[PDB]
Amino acid sequence: NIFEMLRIDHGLRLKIYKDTEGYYTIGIGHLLTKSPSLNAAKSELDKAIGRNTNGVITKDEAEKLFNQDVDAAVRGILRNAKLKPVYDSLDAVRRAALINMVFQMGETGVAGFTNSLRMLQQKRWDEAAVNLAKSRWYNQTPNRAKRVITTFRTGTWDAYKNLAAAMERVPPSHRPPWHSRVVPTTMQQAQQAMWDLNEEAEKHFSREELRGIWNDVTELPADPNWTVDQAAIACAIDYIRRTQTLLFRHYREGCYH
Amino acid sequence: APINFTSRLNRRASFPDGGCFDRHLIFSRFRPISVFREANEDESGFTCCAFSARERFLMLGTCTGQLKLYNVFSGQEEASYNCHNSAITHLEPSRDGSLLLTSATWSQPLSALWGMKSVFDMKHSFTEDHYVEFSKHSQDRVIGTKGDIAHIYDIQTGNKLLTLFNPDLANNYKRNCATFNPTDDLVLNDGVLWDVRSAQAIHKFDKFNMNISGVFHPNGLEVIINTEIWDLRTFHLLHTVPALDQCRVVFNHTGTVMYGAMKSPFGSSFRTFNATDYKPIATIDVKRNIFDLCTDTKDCYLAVIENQGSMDALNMDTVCRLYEVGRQRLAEELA
Amino acid sequence: GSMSYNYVVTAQKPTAVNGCVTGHFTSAEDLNLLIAKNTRLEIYVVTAEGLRPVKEVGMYGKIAVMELFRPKGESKDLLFILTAKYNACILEYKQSGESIDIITRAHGNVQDRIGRPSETGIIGIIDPECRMIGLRLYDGLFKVIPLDRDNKELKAFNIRLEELHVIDVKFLYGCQAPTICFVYQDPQGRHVKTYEVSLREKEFNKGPWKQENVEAEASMVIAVPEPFGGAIIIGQESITYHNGDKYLAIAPPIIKQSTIVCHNRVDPNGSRYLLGDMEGRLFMLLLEKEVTLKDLRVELLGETSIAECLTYLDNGVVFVGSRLGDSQLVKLNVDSNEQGSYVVAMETFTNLGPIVDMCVVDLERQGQGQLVTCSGAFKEGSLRIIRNGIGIHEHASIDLPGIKGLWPLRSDPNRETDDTLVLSFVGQTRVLMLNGEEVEETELMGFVDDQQTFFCGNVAHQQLIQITSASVRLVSQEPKALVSEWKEPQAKNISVASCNSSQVVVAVGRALYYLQIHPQELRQISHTEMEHEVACLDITPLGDSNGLSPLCAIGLWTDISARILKLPSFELLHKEMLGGEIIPRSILMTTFESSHYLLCALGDGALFYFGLNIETGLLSDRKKVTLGTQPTVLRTFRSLSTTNVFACSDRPTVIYSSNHKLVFSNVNLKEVNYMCPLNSDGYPDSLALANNSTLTIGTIDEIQKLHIRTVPLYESPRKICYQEVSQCFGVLSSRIEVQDTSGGTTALRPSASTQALSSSVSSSKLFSSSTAPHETSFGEEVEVHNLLIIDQHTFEVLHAHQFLQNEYALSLVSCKLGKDPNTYFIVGTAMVYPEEAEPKQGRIVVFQYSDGKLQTVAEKEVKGAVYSMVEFNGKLLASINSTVRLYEWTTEKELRTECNHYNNIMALYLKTKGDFILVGDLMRSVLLLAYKPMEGNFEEIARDFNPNWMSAVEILDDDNFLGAENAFNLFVCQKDSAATTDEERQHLQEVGLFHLGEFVNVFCHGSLVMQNLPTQGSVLFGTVNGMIGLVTSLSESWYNLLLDMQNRLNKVIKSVGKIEHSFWRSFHTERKTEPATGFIDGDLIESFLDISRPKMQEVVANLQYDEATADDLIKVVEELTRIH
Ligand SMILES: [Zn+2]
């Protein structure tokens, strides 16, 4: 039931839609075309599926489309140096879980789990499950991963049976802002943001007041680990937090400027 | 209507107001259960709180324009979004869970509307509307406020459907916020009742206050301006309540309880009131400065955004603290 | 997503009366009484007889308004009903000859999507002109439905009502225009105001008379008819009259004692009114006229049941509609009795509501539970014993001991009725004549008395037989002489006998003789020797109506065989080897609903029954049931054209058929040994039974029903539990007393706790130092709470234990704890002070009732009200205000706490299964705990965070939890132990929703059907209206089948008022409204058996399961009815 597996892991949509890159898609993640023309997409679907559809198909249509994608994906595995060994090593149910992975992170990304796949071949299932959880693949999409991993481990579809309605989900995070505390940034960028914020800040407070915040911020202890650049960028970010906080409280109190 | 709960419970089983007494007991009790701190910050910068549409997540705006969503059950951060270039000052998701309204402090756009299905992106911006809010009955339109002016837009076209302002009747209220009545037929702006279809000003209420614009009671029968409760039909003054002075007033989902939250210029407490007769239920004193609060639709949790430390100190560390409604700590508990 | 599969059916319809109205609804000529019982509407014709039942219908809604009206141009009344869910309809009663149907004349839903429902609830009034219907549904609004005949959808229109808190409202009589008159409340006081209702402008105009300032507690307005007009206004201390500028006030002291709550016009002149108050007193309100109103006068008439509503019918007969007690038909007399009462009860109508608590007990027999309920409210409070079975109407009883046999015998050929009866005693025989009603000894000569009679009766050719231990004796009638006589050749003893009109088969040891009855002759036809000794015989002629049977049923010794032999050859046609090694004692051939069976009861209570083919003798479809221990005697009787088999044993049973499935129904008697039918001139369609001491004669009912025995208490029962080991019940009760000038309290009437055989009062000093609260005042009421010890047989109050002053008894358990072998009554209490918001004090008190005395074993002071207690693995689990606490019973016999749980608003309800604990909350619906025994504390497994105001809870199984809440809905929660995260694992998902329309106070596992040898589990439940329901589980296979059946039934069944069944059963609160899921409406499924077979065919079309015909599903639904 690899179709049903991916109906729950990836989702099924019956009307044409756009994926996260803006490309036109149908069924279970079946890319129709990268063209921006919906009519170019509606004709690729109209040739793929037998009839004229106007961009709407029924589940039986989508599975026919899905199985060819699976057919196309196994041909990619069957022609891979790092994946053909272990694809032949598994029964139907457990290879449908490796097809699940190449659908997610590309067949080249799956090829990364070198020692994870070595254990699978050797049919060492429990040990492969534990090393598979130590990947960002697991830590980013833990729901999907631990249900595919239970398929690798036991050769059943049990992680897919009688499930409950999915808990409320929320869109993926944006790319972190420049002042994110683990993604690095530059000093001009930090310096410009202070300059920008100060346009607004100087309308409400004196420069002596704003210097007091700069002083207050730079007189706190820093990482003995930090470079002088990293320490200065840290002072700018704290300054911006403090000042934006003071602006927020000022407007709440009432700004007559 | 026996005063003692145990007498009311017995009478219910055999001889069925008592709901008012039940609310006085329930909505006088708040025990804190969780604190949410901004990840990777020694001093949290939360400014705004609201619950997810299915309230699985607590939505927390930050002083730098970010919107950070936390799993309520686990406290772990689930997602972060970049919304504005200044502190988030207001949040309002749609009931269906598809859209979200935000409001900033000084950056432009002040307010915006965001999608929440698969990609968190801007749908439309309301460049100079400092406050923004959905229509009540059908969440099809957006009402924003620019000073004394009210703007109404459509949540799909984005275009300004109409503009409500009358310089002759206006009160120039400090904290003016335009809003719909529960039927979307009326709009109150700056203390002036408007008829939406005719775009005509129905009535101007008298100004006994400088800041507060006013809200519609969810019962469709009253209009609450600061400390003054006006009959929506006759325009007569029904009650005067000094406790509501200058308080942001929220209603619970069923509209039977009214929250209100306020040297240092901010407040340390929030009050609850029986929504049906405005008698005060309790005054819950947090020891900290408060900047926002919100309830869920289940009357289970109350999220309050509290400044850590001394009140007059005004430290930067501002967290969000969850309370469980109707729940208290006993002496035997604290061991 | 997940889903549950539950099914819920009504065991007892609601019995409380929510409203009653009078008028001319079935025809213009006769007088109807209409009763509303929450969901059912009962129509009666008023007679000198009492009430003639005419038609009972049900609705997909709770009847909130019910008022008759006559539009001009209509020949008889129409009925307006408004549903609690705001379904509105107008109804007409049409009798198409033999068939009766209530047709929906107009219908619609009048709901404002923004509305604050009023304090005093829905009010519905109709003006004297029948020109409008007025609804007060919400505050500040007055809905109006114009009544001109175009308005087939009940299109309404609201009028903005300035006054926002209206107490009561009525349309006035004798007004220029339609005018409402209402009491309303504002900060100045409460007042009476009038408005005119402009129907053509759709607004209010200034009313006829000004407003006045009425009593603080004025609560009902009465519209006085012409010529007087105006309004009477009832309060707690005054009754006032108001008109143009006329006004009068009386304040009789008599009415201050209790609040008047309902009223009724006696005469159309409006000169007299009935008033009922909350302690049951019935008053006459008389308006004195001169002509104009001179004065008002109240006169006490007597006492009725606490009346929810009153209606004077005719000739001084008053219907008292009660919901706290039994409804009544009552007569007002011109003359008072000894006591000075004019009120004499004529007829009592059973009301089980409110069911405050209940329990199931196997008192009399084993395997068939009875319900024992705490019912009624104050002076109406009672225990109700609910038993399933068939009841006999005793009409005679003679103490003639030691009967071995009994037969109805006709004496005179010229008459058609049994007017003699013969009895067998060990060794000899007597005959009695049955003239009139009372019997006296005779003997018809030709009958012996020195030997034991084995049979006698009417045989062919106008003559009578009697078979004894040593003779078959045949006796002609008109001369009445011994006319023929048979005897075994060597004169041995006749062991077994059997006979019918034309045939005799008798056994002597292993021999059988077949003899025919011809004029003046016993012709021996054939003889045989059976393999083994003969135990029992039957030659009942079945089927193709001959009177002469080709078959002989026989049961034998030493091989437990039932054999069907062919007469006269005695050919073996069938040999069924039965189980065991005890003899068959009674074998019988009968026909149930045109289908032949062979019945054969063995000694050890067991009874097989086969399908018998009366042409080939085949025995098929062997089935076995057990009917006691004393060996069973089978004996046949017919009712109208049906036939039944009465099975005499230590547990008497009646066997009949219902849709071709046999019923085995308990008989409400002690132990019947021998039985016969008897249609005498003085006992038509009756029976005759012999209980080993007495011989009783009476009438039996057709089908089995629920039978209710009432134990009055004259107090409020609150909780009940059963102690098997001391063969008594524990019952918590309270009575109301009033403070007097002595400083103490006085009861209003004797009652269970004041008239116990023995009694005690609490010695506890446990709340001495604690604060002295607000003192009580003279004339004010207080509650005195009592533990009652009630004997399981006599239901006498053996002992009454009075609790402390101001102490409420809240919860009760009977159990043993720890290593202690004693069984205790454990009581949870609260110190309830009326000014205090919540009890902060309480007790858990361990009693034991041993050797007729109650002792206090132990005591524990707690810090709040003990709402619930459960025996939990030899430990005491209790809820004290918001904490759940587990107690251990030490070897010193004191309670010592093991662990606490604190995540509650108010922990009201507790149930347990294994180590799991279900907690029900005031507002935050339900919560699952587990006792972790290797840590000795609680683990919180999962919660439901939705705001369901719980009223009762129940564990259906380890994963499924049943809830009832204050909006009359049911729901089911599931845990998912097999969930991949702790967030999932710790959330109970609501997977079942259903609007019951009742308010549930108690669940408990049990069944009122005997169960020996389609449906899993049995949870009974009791409601405020006295309705008793049943919840059970289904497989997904069955749920899908019956869910399909339901939607098909809904297209075919017409609903009164045209209410959609899915709208009625939709889960509905002021927070959300959702369609039902996971619940089969068993009442809808069962109504399948009542539709016409055309309708039945239309439902079954296009349907398959393990096609599907109409007959397949009659077998399904009939099987379903047997769970209750
Ligand atoms: Zn400023």
Author numbering:
A (entry chain C): -165 to 91
B (entry chain B): 1046 to 1061, 1067 to 1312, 1327 to 1399
C (entry chain A): -1 to 288, 295 to 1017, 1023 to 1115, 1123 to 1140
Manuscript excerpt for this entry:
The Vpx/Vpr family of lentiviral accessory proteins usurp the substrate receptor DCAF1 of host Cullin4-RING ligases (CRL4), a family of modular ubiquitin ligases involved in DNA replication, DNA repair and cell cycle regulation. CRL4DCAF1 specificity modulation by Vpx and Vpr from certain simian immunodeficiency viruses (SIV) leads to recruitment, poly-ubiquitylation and subsequent proteasomal degradation of the host restriction factor SAMHD1, resulting in enhanced virus replication in differentiated cells.
Our X-ray crystallographic studies of the DDB1/DCAF1-CtD/Vprmus assembly provide the first structural insight into a class of “hybrid” SIV Vpr proteins. The extended Vprmus N-terminus attaches to the cleft between DCAF1 BP blades 1 and 2 through several hydrogen bonds, electrostatic and hydrophobic interactions. The third interaction surface comprises the C-terminal half of Vprmus Helix-3, which inserts into a ridge on top of DCAF1. Moreover, side chain electrostatic interactions of Vprmus residues R15, R75 and R76 with DCAF1 E1088, E1091 and E1093 lock the conformation of an “acidic loop” upstream of BP blade 1, which is also unstructured and flexible in the absence of Vprmus. Additionally, Vprmus side chains R15, R75 and R76 neutralise the DCAF1 “acidic loop”, precluding the formation of further salt bridges to basic residues in SAMHD1-CtD.
